[model samples]
Target: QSLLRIETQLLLGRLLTRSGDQAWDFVVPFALLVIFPGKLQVAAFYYLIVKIGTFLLTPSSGKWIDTHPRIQVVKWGVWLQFFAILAGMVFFGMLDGLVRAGGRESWLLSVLFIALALSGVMASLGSQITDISVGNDLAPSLVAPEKLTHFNSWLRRIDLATEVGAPILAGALFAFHPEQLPLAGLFLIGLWNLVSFVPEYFLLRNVIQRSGLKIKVLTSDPIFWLILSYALLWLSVLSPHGVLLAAYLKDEMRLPETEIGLFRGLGAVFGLISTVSFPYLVRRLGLISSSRWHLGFQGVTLGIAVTAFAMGSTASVYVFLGCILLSRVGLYGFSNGEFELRQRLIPEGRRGELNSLSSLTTTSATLILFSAGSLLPQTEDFKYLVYVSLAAVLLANVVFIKWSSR
Candidate 1:
């Protein structure tokens, strides 16, 4: 009974944390687009800065999580994220003000950019640390082994819920005052993040105190292969939640913000299907087999999207979007499989280190992706990126197959 209570508390905390992240994730790129109209490259560059920051800091933070008390680590992550985001909000305000005042040529604009970049780094790193602490480190300890699959699915569902709800809320906010500066929407989103911190911190802290949990080495070659395979999947740009796709829709398709947000939210509805199907698939086929199936599924669906996109017809866009949405089911199903695999395979004491290493692998892939985006900033250039992204997904399928066979 007490364990059930602890699990409930942990999930509630995840709800708050994930909501803040989802809302911010949805708003920021679009906000960047508004700030730098027609320059998708700026959004790409901002993402590059954040990814690079995560890439550089992840290993050290992972090491810290491994050595420190679990509670202390959680506190540090929450507080750091709060303050970093607060600073980012301030920078964003100043940047918007300067831009409105026709200060695009001002030297202070550069200063604000650098300041926002720094805050982005801290906030991203802090979020990653908190996720690693709670999801990777604490989840396995709280849930029974046999129930891990169900618990993981529940977590994914929570994520999907926020993924759908928060984006729509952000979209409504943007649509509400389209003529005004986006500062109002940005402020509200930032405020939501700030308010969410208090309950999230207390909920996690209470769960830790009640459960009394404390938090590996990687030896298997398959582990490296698995990480490499998953990292490759991270290179895909077709994901509905991805900034590149959103930018493409906004810039090239000239879709409204509300429609883009609706599409993004719908993508998660497809992902929710996976939460329902994953545990059942795992039960029938086993974890590795289920994962392979999902990878294949995503590959096929995305292949269709790529083909439709290449046809260069007006109607093909809907086909491409539909296929991308359908592909989310497979993408998220595979995600759950990957999470469970790590939970089962990683050494208990080395979860933080190894998971961080996994994060580093994916972060590097994302860095390469954003770098490519920086180079190919135009809407017409995005098709080539889509091709490369599809190739990466197919390669990830091949690599995961090799790992499973071994």
Candidate 2:
């Protein structure tokens, strides 16, 4: 990624977090969701809570696009996110206080999710409403259409940098200090959100809405689906180790979390390298060409990862890690291409609704398949072994998508 400071990246990093919740979401619940099988309902409920914000509020934000200045929407988006973070922090402390004082159970957790979900709805709507409006309004005044892809590639790389750090940091918190980790992460992230608001409030303002009519024009298109497929990749990759590679190494492979941290730390190095290379490809080849290349490379890399990981060879693991760098770089590249396309295609009034809808639907699809993937071995007891099948499916989709391009 080329370091394009689209306000959305900062906003996204601030609002949506599995940062505190990942232990429950990715590690604890995931293990139980498959081992006991009934826990899928709990996972579904939590995920659904998050999606409520993503889905219900996304389109509503879009509706406001036709009504407000773009700057006003961005300002509202940032403020809502800041307030949401504050609410979570305040309620979190209150919950801890209540529980310690022998009050109610940590009912605040569910209430916090409700607040998060609702805040997410407003923030996403406002941000998308603002972002699209500005880019659409400004590009005509400042940039050429052809440059958007290269510009967006940089944006993608930075956004993913957050993910690259997120998991390892999340896992290490457990490895190093499980007790304090969630509290520390929540407060710090919430702090980050608050600090961001000060600059955003003064710096941005409402501009004209680009498409004066409605948000629906963006949702009913096929390119939207194709772009969303890339986002779906995250849900598809959700193994127990998907984010908790440290936990996976410790529990599954019998490695210590400390040693696993070293391994994951190396992964961070690789992620940075892949990120740097993405924009170069974009500048040289343009979006579609980079995307096709990305698809092929990512498919091959996943196939290699499945093979290496299945063999249980340490050397193979090392090689597979290297291969991951190759494919992930392509993933960022492909995503950049997708972002450029969506930015160009979506009407200003519809951007938030469409992206939110895209995230909600695809992630739901992910939870279903992932639950199935996680549950398979329960009946047969060899289900964890079926994760290899995920690689094959990813490869197949890549082939189909690429072939269809012709």
Candidate 3:
């Protein structure tokens, strides 16, 4: 019962942080598009900058996470995120007004871009650190070994719920006025992130205090193969939850914001299924076998989606969307399996560095993805990227297979 109470506090903090983070993430690209109308490249560029910053800083942050007391690391991450989001809010508000005033070509626009990019990097890094600290670092310490899978599934459910609900809520906030700048929505998101920090911080702190302070290695080993397999999954742009796909639907398919938001939310419904099924699969088949099955499931579903996409019919888009949604089930199941494998496989002393290295791998993949997005900004160009994404998933399955065999 005491352990349950601690877990409850941890989860409550996760809910607040994840919801705020999810909403901000969903709104940013749309806000950028709104600020720079007809410029998909702007959004891509912003993402590139953010990813680059994260790629560069992740290792040090990982080291920091490993060396520091868990509670201190949590506090640092939360505070960093709070300030970063606040700065982003200010920069965005100013940028919206500046662009509206026809300062798009002015020097101040450049300054604001630089400022926003820096803030984005901070927020991204902070969120990454916080997630790593709570989910990866602290979770295992709080739960019994037998209960880790169940707890991880619950954590993932919290994440998926926000994934499903936050976008829809953000969509509603944006829909309040289609013709004007979503300044109100922007402010509200910022406010939500800001207010969330204190309570979230305290809840997590309480968890840490109540629990006896409870609780990984690098490449050249089998774990490297697993990390590579997981990182490969990051390279894909075909997922409905991704920014690229959302941009494709909005700019290419000419869908409305609400429709795109609904599509994004629906993708997580499939993901939620995986959260429900993952613990059962883990219990029945063991972690490695379950992961292998989910990886294959994702690859097959995505392969069919690619085929549908290549058909070039109007109806094929819908087919592609459906397959993509189904693919998420496998994607997230594989994700949970990956998480548990890492929890079980990593050396406790090296957890921070190795996890961050894993993050570095995925960040590198994302950098390539956004670079491609920036280079190929057309609707027609998206098909090539989707093909690349499918190939990445297939490649990941092969890598995971090798790891499992080893």
Judging by TM-score, tell me the better candidate of 1 and 3: 1
**Residues 167-213 of candidate 3: C-alpha lDDT, one tens digit per residue:** 88877776565356558777887788788788888886676676654
Report model 3's TM-score to 2 decimal places: 0.78
lDDT of 3 at 120: 97
Pick the TM-score winner.
1
- What lDDT does candidate 1 reach at residue 121? 94
lDDT string, candidate 1, 1-406, tens digits: 4656766776887787677878887878777766677777778888898777776787877876776666777788889999998998898888888888988898988889888988999998888777766666455656677888877878877877888887877777755544666578778888888988988888877767766633311106658988898899889999988999888887777778787888899997888788887877888988888899888899999999999998867799889999999998888998888888999988789888878788779978988999998887566688888999999999999999998985
Weakest ten-residue segment in model 1 by summed lDDT: 213-222
Candidate 3, after superposition: displacement of residue 379 in Å?
A: 5.4
Clashes of 2: 7
Candidate lDDT scores, in order, read 0.82, 0.50, 0.81
User: Highest lDDT among the candidates is held by which one?
Assistant: 1
After aligning candidate 2 to the native by TM-score, how far in Å is the CA of 61 from where it should be? 2.9
lDDT of each residue in 332-373, candidate 2, tens digit only: 556666677678678889888778876666677655544544
Displacement of the residue 91 alpha carbon in candidate 2, Å: 3.8
